[PDB]
């Protein structure tokens, strides 16, 4: 029944955090956890394609997108598979992650196992921007921390 | 308790020059580090937070970098306005602790600003002498 995964965020800067993934049957993937050292506000949160950490977070590559769609928010139909929108940090610099999603998975063709979670400098505009960039990255800006997604207990 | 240590303790530089203060923590503070600037007889001002992010309304000549235990503030092209004491603060662990400051003054080659400075220095002296009168006047009223 139950697949579990885990992800430890790391970067050059002050950002840290552990993300947990649970998925029962082929129900939704429940993402949870905590991210620290953020500035107050919204921060783009996406599964990128590669779990390649050889060159920091740059080597993770673009948003995980097997259906060759354009970038969007989590509720859009036109979205990347990885596009999980925004996490929200308070005045304490902390974000509590709580996300449920159906397009991502912990097995099969849409598995995120062995790929990278990335939290971003700015807010993800959900693809509703005034430029080319918005339908690629959502103008979330630079990558503060990332981690490969591993199999958990 | 984390000891943050700055160097140099003071320094001089000419206009246009590139300046680099450092701050060294006695343990890893994971870039939880803020830089404050304090001009003479004025309140502190926030330059940089989380090691490298500029605050609002800060000239871009100011830049910050570093990680682990060792960090630095860099003014790229020094204007005359920038003569001040600079302070690093860590907020990774409590209590929050602060460097002892680097004083920065000009080398080589704005009149009313002297008046508040002088009035402030005189008021120090007045209250100094008022505290010396205070005991004597208490003794008189007995």
């Amino acid at each position: 029944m139950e697949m579990k995964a885990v992800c430890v965020l790391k970067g050059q800067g002050p950002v840290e955090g552990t993300i947990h993934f649970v998925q029962k049957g082929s129900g939704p993937v429940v993402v949870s956890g905590t991210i620290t050292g953020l500035t107050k506000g919204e921060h783009g949160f996406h599964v990128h394609q590669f779990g390649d950490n050889t060159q920091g977070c740059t080597s993770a590559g673009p948003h995980f997108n097997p259906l060759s769609k354009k970038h969007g928010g989590p509720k859009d139909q036109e979205r990347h598979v990885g596009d999980l929108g925004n996490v929200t940090a308070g005045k304490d610099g902390v974000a509590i992650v709580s996300i449920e999603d159906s397009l991502i998975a912990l097995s099969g063709d849409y598995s995120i196992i062995g790929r990278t979670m990335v939290v971003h400098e700015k807010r993800d505009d959900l693809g509703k921007g005034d430029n080319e960039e918005s339908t690629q990255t959502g103008n979330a800006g630079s990558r503060l921390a990332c981690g490969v997604i591993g199999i958990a207990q | 308790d984390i000891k943050m240590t700055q160097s140099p303790s003071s320094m001089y530089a000419s206009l246009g020059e590139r300046v680099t203060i450092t701050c060294k923590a006695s343990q890893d503070i994971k870039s939880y580090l803020s830089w404050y600037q304090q001009k003479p007889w004025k309140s502190p001002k926030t330059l940089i937070y989380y090691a490298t992010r500029l605050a609002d309304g800060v000239p871009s000549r100011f830049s910050g970098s570093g990680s682990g235990q060792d960090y630095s503030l860099t003014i790229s092209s020094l204007e005359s306005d920038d003569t001040a004491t600079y302070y690093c603060l860590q907020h990774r662990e409590r209590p929050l602790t602060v460097g002892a400051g680097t004083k920065l003054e000009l080398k080589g080659s704005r009149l009313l600003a002297l008046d508040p400075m002088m009035e402030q220095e005189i008021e120090e002296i007045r209250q100094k002498y008022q505290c010396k009168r205070q005991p004597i006047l208490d003794a008189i009223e007995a």
């Epitope: 005045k91 610099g93 | 939880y32 926030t46 989380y50 907020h91």
Partner: nanobody, 116 residues
Framework: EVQLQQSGAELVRPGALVKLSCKAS????????MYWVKQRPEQGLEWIGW????????IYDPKFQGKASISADTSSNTAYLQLSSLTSEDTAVYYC??????????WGQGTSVTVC
């Protein structure tokens, strides 16, 4: 247009209590933390403590826990610092500031306290 107005100069007898204030305009102090910072003459900054006005939770440096007491009135949008058992060690300039946990966005002009 943000501003922190601090109370005026104080001059007190040893052992006196004194209560400094910080009146904020331009932001709701509930959305921030209100910090207090001491600077002795010809010396650097020491951080005293902060309050979260949203729940009145206060962190202090142990050096000052007992001498110093930080409080906020969310209605008048004002923060307070109370120094007790004052000695010459306490003669200093006290700055109030407001910001997230990771920066001070706003600083007061500072209140001098002198102890005889």
């Amino acid at each position: 247009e943000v501003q922190l107005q601090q109370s005026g100069a104080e001059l007190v007898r040893p052992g006196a209590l004194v209560k400094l204030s910080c009146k904020a305009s331009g932001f709701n102090i509930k959305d921030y933390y209100m910090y207090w910072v001491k600077q002795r003459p010809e010396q650097g900054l020491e951080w005293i403590g902060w309050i979260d006005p949203e729940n009145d939770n206060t962190i202090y440096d142990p050096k000052f826990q007992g001498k110093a007491s930080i409080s906020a009135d969310t209605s008048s949008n004002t923060a307070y610092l109370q120094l007790s058992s004052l000695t010459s060690e306490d003669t200093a300039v006290y700055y109030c500031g407001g910001g997230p946990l990771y920066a001070m966005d706003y600083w007061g002009q500072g209140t001098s306290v002198t102890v005889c």
